Amino acid sequence: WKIPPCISNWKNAKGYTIPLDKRLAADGRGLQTVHINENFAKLAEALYI
Amino acid sequence: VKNKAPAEVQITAEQLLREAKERELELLPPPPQQ
Amino acid sequence: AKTVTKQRVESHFDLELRAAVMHDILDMMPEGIKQNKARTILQHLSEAWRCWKANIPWKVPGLPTPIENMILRYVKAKADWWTNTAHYNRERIRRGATVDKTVCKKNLGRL
Amino acid sequence: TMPKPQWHPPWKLYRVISGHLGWVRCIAVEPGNQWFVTGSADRTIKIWDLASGKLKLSLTGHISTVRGVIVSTRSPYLFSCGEDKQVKCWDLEYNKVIRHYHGHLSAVYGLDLHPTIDVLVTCSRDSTARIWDVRTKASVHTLSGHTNAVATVRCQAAEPQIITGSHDTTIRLWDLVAGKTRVTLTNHKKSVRAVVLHPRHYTFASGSPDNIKQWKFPDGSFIQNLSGHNAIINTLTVNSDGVLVSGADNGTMHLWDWRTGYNFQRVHAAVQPGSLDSESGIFACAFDQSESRLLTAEADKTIKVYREDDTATEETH
Amino acid sequence: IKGGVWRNTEDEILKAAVMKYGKNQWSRIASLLHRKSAKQCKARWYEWLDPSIKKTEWSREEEEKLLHLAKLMPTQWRTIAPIIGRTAAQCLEHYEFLLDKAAQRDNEEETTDDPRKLKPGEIDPNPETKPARPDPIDMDEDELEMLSEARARLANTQGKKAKRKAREKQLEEARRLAALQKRRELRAAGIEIQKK
Amino acid sequence: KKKRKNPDLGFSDYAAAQLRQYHRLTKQIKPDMETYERLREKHGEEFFPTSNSLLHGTHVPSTEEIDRMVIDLEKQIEKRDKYSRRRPYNDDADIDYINERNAKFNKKAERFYGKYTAEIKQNLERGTAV
Ligand SMILES: [Mg+2]
Numbered sequence: 001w002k003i004p005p006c007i008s009n010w011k012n013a014k015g016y017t018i019p020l021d022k023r024l025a026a027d028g029r030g031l032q033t034v035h036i037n038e039n040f041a042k043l044a045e046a047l048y049i
Numbered sequence: 050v051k052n053k054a055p056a057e058v059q060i061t062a063e064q065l066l067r068e069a070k071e072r073e074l075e076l077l078p079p080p081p082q083q
Numbered sequence: 084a085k086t087v088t089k090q091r092v093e094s095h096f097d098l099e100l101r102a103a104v105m106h107d108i109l110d111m112m113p114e115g116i117k118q119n120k121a122r123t124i125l126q127h128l129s130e131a132w133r134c135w136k137a138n139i140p141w142k143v144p145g146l147p148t149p150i151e152n153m154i155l156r157y158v159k160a161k162a163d164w165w166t167n168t169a170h171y172n173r174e175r176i177r178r179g180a181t182v183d184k185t186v187c188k189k190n191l192g193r194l
Numbered sequence: 195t196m197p198k199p200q201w202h203p204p205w206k207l208y209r210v211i212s213g214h215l216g217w218v219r220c221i222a223v224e225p226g227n228q229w230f231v232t233g234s235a236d237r238t239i240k241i242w243d244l245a246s247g248k249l250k251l252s253l254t255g256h257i258s259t260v261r262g263v264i265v266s267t268r269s270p271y272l273f274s275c276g277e278d279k280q281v282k283c284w285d286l287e288y289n290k291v292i293r294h295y296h297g298h299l300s301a302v303y304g305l306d307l308h309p310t311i312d313v314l315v316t317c318s319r320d321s322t323a324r325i326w327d328v329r330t331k332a333s334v335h336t337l338s339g340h341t342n343a344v345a346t347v348r349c350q351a352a353e354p355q356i357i358t359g360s361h362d363t364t365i366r367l368w369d370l371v372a373g374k375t376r377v378t379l380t381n382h383k384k385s386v387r388a389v390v391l392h393p394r395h396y397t398f399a400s401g402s403p404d405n406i407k408q409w410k411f412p413d414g415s416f417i418q419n420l421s422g423h424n425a426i427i428n429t430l431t432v433n434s435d436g437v438l439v440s441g442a443d444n445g446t447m448h449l450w451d452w453r454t455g456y457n458f459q460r461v462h463a464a465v466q467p468g469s470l471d472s473e474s475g476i477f478a479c480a481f482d483q484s485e486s487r488l489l490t491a492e493a494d495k496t497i498k499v500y501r502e503d504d505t506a507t508e509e510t511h
Numbered sequence: 512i513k514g515g516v517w518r519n520t521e522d523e524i525l526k527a528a529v530m531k532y533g534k535n536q537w538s539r540i541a542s543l544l545h546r547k548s549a550k551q552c553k554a555r556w557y558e559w560l561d562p563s564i565k566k567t568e569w570s571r572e573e574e575e576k577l578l579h580l581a582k583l584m585p586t587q588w589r590t591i592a593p594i595i596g597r598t599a600a601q602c603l604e605h606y607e608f609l610l611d612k613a614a615q616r617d618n619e620e621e622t623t624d625d626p627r628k629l630k631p632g633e634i635d636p637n638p639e640t641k642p643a644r645p646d647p648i649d650m651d652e653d654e655l656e657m658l659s660e661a662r663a664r665l666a667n668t669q670g671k672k673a674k675r676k677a678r679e680k681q682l683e684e685a686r687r688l689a690a691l692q693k694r695r696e697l698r699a700a701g702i703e704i705q706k707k
Numbered sequence: 708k709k710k711r712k713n714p715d716l717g718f719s720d721y722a723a724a725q726l727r728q729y730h731r732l733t734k735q736i737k738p739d740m741e742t743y744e745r746l747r748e749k750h751g752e753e754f755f756p757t758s759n760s761l762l763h764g765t766h767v768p769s770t771e772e773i774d775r776m777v778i779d780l781e782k783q784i785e786k787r788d789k790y791s792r793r794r795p796y797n798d799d800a801d802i803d804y805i806n807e808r809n810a811k812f813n814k815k816a817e818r819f820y821g822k823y824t825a826e827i828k829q830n831l832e833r834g835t836a837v
Contacts, residue, residue: 001116004145004819005812006126009535010133015668016809017066017531020562021827022816024534028140030563034593036580044583055645059519062527063801065658069665070805077677080684083691084299087257087278096258099277099301102319106343106361107443110384110403110426115720144823152472156493159470160217160235167215167236530803562830565837666805 096164104128104157111149128154132161169193197454201510202437203502204459205449205488211247211497212466214240218491220263221478230482231272232491233260239274239284244482247499253284255291262305262316269328273314275302281316283328293331297324308349313370315356317344323358325370335373339366345387348398353412359386359400367414377414381407390430390438392452399452401427401440408455420455423448429479439481441490445474458509461500469494513548515634517555518644520654524661525552526560531665543661545653555639558598565597569605573597581606600640732783 007022087095108124127143131154134141143151172190175182216235223230229250233239239260241251258277265272272284281295281302299320306315313334314326323337323344342361349356354367354376365386367377382402389400397417399408405421425442432438436452449459465474475493482489488500521544528540534556537549544552558564569577573595580591592599615621635641646654669677697704718724747754753762804810830837 001112001147002145002819003120003123003127003147003150004143005123005815006130007816007820008126008130008133009139009533010130012531012533014806014808015531016812017665017803017805018813018816019803019828020526020530020831021824022813022820023530024562024827025144025820025824026134026139026142027144027823028142031142032140036594040583044585051647051649051651053647053649056648059645060523060658062523062530063803065523065527065661065665066530066805067802069662070802072662072666074663074666075669075806077681081688083688084279084297086280086296092257095277099258099319102301102343106385107426109361110387114383114404145819155470155472156475159473163216164235560835562827562835564835566834567836668806 100157100161101125104153107153108150111153124150124154128157131155131158135162165193197456199451199454199456199458199511200436201507202435202449202451202458203504204509205461205500206503207461207463207498207500209247209499210466211242211499212495213249214238214495214497216259216495217475217477217493218495218497219259219261219477221480221489221491221497222263222265223480223482223489224265225267225483227483230480230489231263231265232497233263233274233276234491234495235259237276239263239272242497244487251289253289255282256280258301261301261303264305264307266307267309268312271328273305273307275305275316277301281305281314281326293328295324295326295331297333298322303344304346306347306349308351308355308370310351313349315347315349317347317358317360319343321360321362323347323356323368325356325373335370337366337368337373337375339375339378340364342385345385346389348389348391350391350411352396357389357391357398359389359402361385361387363402365389365400365414367411379409379414381416384426387426387428388430388440390432392432393434395452399430399432399438401430403427406430406440408452418455420450420457422457423450428475428477431479431481433481433485435485439479439488441476441479443475443493445476445493447476447479447490456511463490463492463498466494466496513546514551514638515546516638516644517559517641518646518654520646520650520658521547522555522560522643524657525555527661527665529556529560543657543664545657551639554637558600558637558639559642564601574605574609577602577606578609598640600637728786732779 007018007025009023009026012018085091104125105121108121109118112118127146127150131141133139135158169190172182172186173194176187176190214232214234214236216237218232218234220233221230223244227244229241230244231239231241237254237256237258237260239253239256240249241253242248243250256274256276256278257280260274260276262275263272264274270286272286273282274284275281279298279300279302281298282291283293283295284290285292295314295316298316298318299322301319302316303319304317307313308315312328314328316324316326318324321338321340321342321344323340324333325335325337326332327334337356337358340358340360340362344358344360346360347356347358355370356368357365358368359365359382363380363382363385365379365382366375367379368374369376379400382400382404384403386400386402389398391398396411397408398411399406399420401407403424403426405419406423406427407416408418408420409415410417420438423440423442423446425444425446427440427442429441430438432452438450438452439447440450441447445463445465447461447463448457449461450457463474465471473494476490477493478491480489481487486501490498490500492498524544525540528543532539537553541547541549541552547555576595577591580594584590588599588603592602595602597605650658713727715727750762753760756762802810804813826837
């Protein structure tokens, strides 16, 4: 039941300096996992043919 | 006369942070011994 | 006992949202908790609302799932309030009804 | 096994009413089973048809979330309260607000009507309960003495006439005439968010996330301890057949024997299609005047309607 | 009259300013670096300073997936780039390098076909994709003043009202010691003037 | 020869540390049998009282008892004041704070998020790569 602190991308009210790994610790935009489809291939190859 | 030449120190961000910590523009002095 | 008239509405909503979250985290913590740590969960909720408005996917790496679920619940509630207010003011701006200039700028910014 | 519990038939959902655009925070049934009110966080009050489940009217006028709604039995009125700080009387002859009750310093969480005097009582977040005359819209008394937000209040005609739990984990049994506390019951460990009155047996129940407790009325004696529904419970309601309903913030709802304190059914309902798993939750539940339908105001912006299963004993512990 | 080539001093002030202000305040960072705007600071961050930008050597499966996606999505480097995990400028540059290593082997030998098609007498359209000049020994008034302003703004956290209240507290302490000295003298010699 | 091991586990409660502290104080104390048998022979029947006997408002402790209590309580206050030992401050680590509170907040960030943000610090120290 421990609550880690809130390192915000917007508010720095007491003007602190936070290390980059703690600053860019937004996991959700790193696990977004840009994944492609397989029907791009059929389209591109058919257009070249 | 100003010389352009590649340096040796190559000042970094943590050096700026360390030299910024010692400015002390918010530490008020203690009250005098009254 | 001042009335929530027109310029107190968003401040009163965000005043009451914090209070509901405070009551829920005082009821949600188990029996042997130090009864601190309310301000941090409130900051996590404000940051989760900012990440909803920015369309940034919000995930805290270590966080208890009741706190995370409750924050997602109240962020969805504030999302609903925000969006229904935007729909209402857009219909008013379209029909030509009496609207403020600030609500026109706020509504453009929401849309 | 010291008691032997009465068999109650299990309940099942048969109707999911939808159409609010916010958490449905309150529900109440008309004295004639023709319609029922809901109030929600979309700042409206909706008259629903109780038989067909069809929206009968929508009443705008609140500036914030509607927290309590009640229909008067002596007079043709509809009292409602909100996070607005506004307490209103709706004349149902005209469907318009005729009287607004002013004086709450913060949000108003619940309200109840006295069954015989025409006196409204309200809970607020400013740690007070107020006592209003309907006809003169004035504060008779300000019940102060809780230290946190006041969550629920009830009324009798008989002794202690005002019973209120609050978020300071205490329950005060009051004097309507004097305006002072008679009994402070501190047995709960977490916040009392629902008190409920039995129609016949002159006892009451009270709920908090640790456990739920049953209590004699004159001075608050401990009688019993109903446990097992360990979540943040929001409402309790009593059937004259001795069925007690406990609905929680996590959507779980338990069905209980009033007398023996036995859990005969657990109901974990499912959310609406668009809704989210973290959004299952019950804020209100109420029986109709026939006491054969259970109306639950849910956190997925729904009204779920339950009735008894007509299949015989497959049950008894 | 903004931009140009990025030096190491500006990039380190940019790193420290991202450490202080975050990746959603670029006009507060670009106030710390003159001759650089907020769009330029943002672009320099996301194109050479983010520690997810793989500045290492291209592997084999990376350039295989590169050729597959570039044949697969023609001239769509902002779409190809998050898939293969590189900056779109690096992705385009390495693709042109791989096409050069096939066109040169297929037709030519070293030269012969048009010696230079590079860019003379011009300003480079994307100088944020290029590595940083080192710092010259004799830093001028601009660079040293920029470093001094950088340290003086990385130190500060207080606003107007806190700074006037600290000075007001020091003035209250000074006038308290002064009235203390006056009252101590009036009680030492002995003169019983009462106050209001 | 005797040997006893008593390390500490995690905190988990304000009552468990109280219980540990009470067992320490209550094992350190030594009873005096002379004063005990004296007060026993003086008090007689009521020396083994119930919840409700009579003596609640009677006892007047002499100076030596209250002096022993005050000295013991001063020792207990000292043992309480030695609870949070200051860790030694090295200035060789690359400092990432401009204030006095910023250092402790960065320490809390290294406590909580230090297990998860272990790749990005490696990326920073190798030159913003990988
Ligand atoms: Mg300013």
